Curated annotation (Swiss-Prot):
Domain named RRM: residues: 1-77, 87-165
Gene Ontology MF terms in the entry: mRNA binding; poly(U) RNA binding; ribosome binding
Location relative to the cell: Cytoplasm; Nucleus; Cytoplasm, P-body; Cytoplasm, Stress granule
Keywords noted in UniProt: Acetylation, Cytoplasm, Methylation, Nucleus, Repeat, RNA-binding
GO cellular component terms listed in the entry, alphabetical order: cytoplasm; cytoplasmic stress granule; nucleus; P-body
Protein name: Nuclear and cytoplasmic polyadenylated RNA-binding protein PUB1
GO BP term, pick one: translational termination
Function summary: May be associated with hnRNA within the nucleus and remains associated during nucleocytoplasmic mRNA transport, once the proteins are in the cytoplasm, disassembly of PUB1-RNA complexes may occur prior to PAB1 binding and formation of a translationally competent RNP complex. Binds to polyadenylated RNA; prefers to bind poly(rU); binds to T-rich single-stranded DNA.
Subunit description: Interacts with NAB2.
Domain of life: Eukaryota
Miscellaneous notes: Present with 49600 molecules/cell in log phase SD medium.
Coiled-coil spans in chain: none
Amino acid sequence: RVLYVGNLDKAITEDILKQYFQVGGPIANIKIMIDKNKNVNYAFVEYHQSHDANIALQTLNGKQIENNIVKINWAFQSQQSSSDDTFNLFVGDLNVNVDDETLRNAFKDFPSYLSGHVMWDMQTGSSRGYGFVSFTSQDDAQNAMDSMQGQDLNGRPLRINWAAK
């Protein structure tokens, strides 16, 4: 239901966004992200129905609203728990049969291991084919990355890299 709108002319307000993006149907929420310095803003426009958002994308994508031409995406959104002072690794190319527990059992014996989460489809409960592992130490996360890079888990090679450094 959420569209990302990019390359927004900085003079464009929420009210101006509403008069264009209403073209798809009733809007539940508009949120413009004002740059506090950049030449353009971006926004999130949320509809009640997926069908409505698609109309707005279809109709308005690549069009001049004022000075800049508008770039619309379906917004990638996630819900993730977090822990302070941790060093997190992305772990991709996960076999669809790999769950948090399988991932845990693959990294737990490495020094400073904290947690592992597979990224789940919010509606279906299917694996997105990637996840994250957390460590309390940067050198130890580095150690786990070097040791598990390309290594096979449930038939598939692990793709690892820093998520936030």
